[PDB]
């Protein structure tokens with residue numbers, strides 16, 4: 001029992017982390033096979049971010065860059081020694097709504113790990129300080145590591161922005177300091193529904209009134225509260241949770257609809273008095289049934 | 291910027307994790323130097339938890355137990371090979387209010403990491419499934435690992451209970467299945483005050499009214515809302531946060547006092563509409579100022 005916001009173990013990424021310096025500028029990079037990835041704005045100097053040559057250390061072991069190139073927004077420093085601590089990996093691209101773990105690092109040493117979601121506006125609500133550029137976000141499948149995120153920058157609203165491991169940015173964003181107003185993030189509705197399932201499994205059922213409602217009547221309400229519309233694909237993926245708790249998707253929709261319109265009222269669901277949207281349905285299955 | 295509930299990297303603990311089987315019964319254990327720790331109720335059989343010989347595998351490497359002994363509530367399996375992946379460690383005991391990271395494991399393999407607090411009633415609000423007994427909770431200081439918790443059991447109220455690494459249980463609890471009604475956990479007031487600081491640092495200041503109030507007048511209110519009394523030692527440790535934000539401890543006390551009595555009212559502080567008590571003041575300093 002218990003539900004808790006839970007990151008994957010960080011051991012296999014920690015030993016792929018490295019410190020990268022170019023001129024005065026030093027940040028974090030990822031070491032896989034014989035190539036080190038890192039954000040390309042490492043070649044800028046920071047004085048020039050106010051108005052209009054490589055060192056690679058793996059803790060204490062110096063690698064020689066023997067050349068580099070630029071794929072989109074990331075630099076691919078080719079090194080001579082090949083990392084023996086390279087796990088099974090693959091470079092996946094994430095869609096809004098999916099979640100991952102972030103291992104925040106400074107000067108190449110890991111400091112923390114935490115779980116967060118790729119918001120519908122393509123930003124992520126991270127915890128980043130200066131020096132964190134180059135930290136990676138990832139999922140793991142027992143022993144295969146799916147890298148899906150590298151940090152680049154902090155937008156003016158406090159939120160964060162970065163790329164996939166091939167260099168392409170997640171949203172309409174660029175590796176430069178500007179007022180890049182990202183869209184309003186909507187609340188991830190499939191995830192809120194999944195968290196409500198995790199509540200049921202674990203104790204809380206007061207919100208379960210479930211006046212049966214249809215799909216689109218819910219969507220009508222959902223949208224004038226800034227909830228992303230629910231599609232058939234979202235319904236499908238709740239299948240397993242539906243199966244376990246014996247509460248059809250339309251019911252949980254309906255019960256949430258009285259939450260949006262009649263409110264939490266200070267009442268508590270799984271340690272919270274607001275509707276959590278940063279757990280995917282697979283999250284709930286991994287945590288609530290192995 | 292950003293505040294996010296953040297566990298220490300789990301790499302150094304992951305390689306001290308091992309699977310332990312005794313008769314039919316198999317769970318998780320910790321391997322340090324040449325001794326493996328694990329809960330002593332490994333020698334029970336589970337059929338007998340309803341009404342009134344060692345295998346140690348490190349993934350695939352079998353260790354020979356050459357003997358064992360019982361310190362309090364944990365078994366110390368002495369093995370012949372000594373773990374080369376043993377970090378700097380020390381066995382600390384935690385007091386209620388302090389926080390740690392839990393690396394949940396099944397059949398000796400790590401599955402997740404997460405952050406939680408030792409509640410004032412000596413229970414912890416974990417995320418544990420059958421098979422998780424023997425998982426450890428710990429803090430790290432850059433390279434020294436302070437082990438402070440090993441999981442034993444789940445109380446009837448869903449909460450969890452365990453020991454320090456020397457075998458002694460945290461509260462008035464025992465390694466047996468009974469209705470052990472633990473006390474009401476009070477809300478950790480020093481921590482709520484620290485989270486309010488992290489809010490200020492990061493954006494949110496609406497709760498800052500700060501009608502100056504005294505210490506004990508606050509305590510009067512605090513207690514009839516089930517908030518643990520605030521001592522001089524708690525005031526002291528908020529010193530640094532006080533220094534950074536330029537808002538004296540009595541002010542934040544006072545502002546929280548109007549939160550307890552005039553309510554959140556759906557309003558949001560750092561992604562939440564209830565008062566979070568599971569961040570220590572050192573947590574805020576580590577996350578908000580390196």
Ligand SMILES: *CC(=O)N1c2ccc(C(=O)OC)cc2NC2=C(C(=O)CCC2)[C@H]1c1ccc(C(F)(F)F)cc1
Pocket residue numbers: 025026027041042044046049129130131132133134151152153154175176177
């Ligand atoms: C992500 C990060 O830690 N930093 C960062 C942020 C933005 C950009 C950018 O837009 O470049 C065009 C670059 C960086 N790079 C680095 C840092 C560092 O602190 C270390 C060196 C890499 C920080 C950073 C740097 C400068 C600033 C400033 F001055 F613009 F405000 C902020 C963060």
Ligand SMILES: *CC(=O)N1c2ccc(C(=O)OC)cc2NC2=C(C(=O)CCC2)[C@H]1c1ccc(C(F)(F)F)cc1
Pocket residue numbers: 315316317331332334336339419420421422423424441442443444465466467
């Ligand atoms: C912590 C844990 O995972 N388990 C557990 C819980 C309590 C006790 C206990 O009170 O013993 C006197 C022992 C255990 N031990 C083990 C398990 C396992 O699933 C694997 C073997 C170790 C579980 C567990 C076992 C049995 C039950 C039961 F039947 F009592 F409900 C519950 C959890």
